[PDB]
Design a protein around this ligand. Structure first.
Ligand SMILES: *[C@@H]1O[C@H](CO)[C@@H](O)[C@H](O)[C@H]1NC(C)=O
Ligand SMILES: *[C@@H]1O[C@H](CO)[C@@H](O)[C@H](O)[C@H]1NC(C)=O
Ligand SMILES: *[C@@H]1O[C@H](CO)[C@@H](O)[C@H](O)[C@H]1NC(C)=O
Lengths: 50, 57
């Protein structure tokens, strides 16, 4: 396991789908808020229904 | 462009991601996007421009 900062790991994972690294770093707060919100939807979905 | 930025503690370099081969940071090794203020954790450094020695002629 080689440590790497999580924002830089996500910039590699963006660069792997053909979206340039600067698109993450310029939008990092928005990308983090969309992710944090999307796990909130998973928790609420599993909490809501069997 | 194709690497990651790295420092040995005194100097800044760009390396390929899977093997430590450090290189000088240049306008060929890197691409611009926008002003400094948008990015969390950006650092000040020189970026070398390979045309400047030619303009020094
Ligand atoms: C960092 O790299 C430069 C260039 O090779 C070298 O002059 C400097 O001494 C290095 N610093 C350390 C802490 O090794
Ligand atoms: C790295 O972590 C420290 C400790 O939490 C923090 O002060 C610093 O702002 C972080 N670096 C960046 C790039 O924000
Ligand atoms: C980077 O350089 C600018 C302009 O000289 C300065 O305002 C800023 O505080 C510097 N940033 C750091 C982290 O030293």
């Amino acid at each position: 396991a080689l440590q790497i900062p999580f924002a830089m790991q996500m910039a590699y994972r963006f660069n792997g789908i053909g979206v340039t690294q600067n698109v993450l770093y310029e939008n990092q707060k928005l990308i983090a808020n969309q992710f944090n919100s999307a796990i909130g939807k998973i928790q609420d979905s599993l909490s809501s229904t069997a | 462009r194709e690497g990651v930025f790295v420092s040995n503690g005194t100097h800044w370099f760009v390396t390929q991601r899977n093997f430590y081969e450090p290189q000088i940071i240049t306008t060929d090794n890197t691409f611009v996007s926008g002003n400094c203020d948008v990015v969390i954790g950006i650092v000040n450094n020189t970026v070398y421009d390979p045309l400047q020695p030619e303009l020094d002629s």
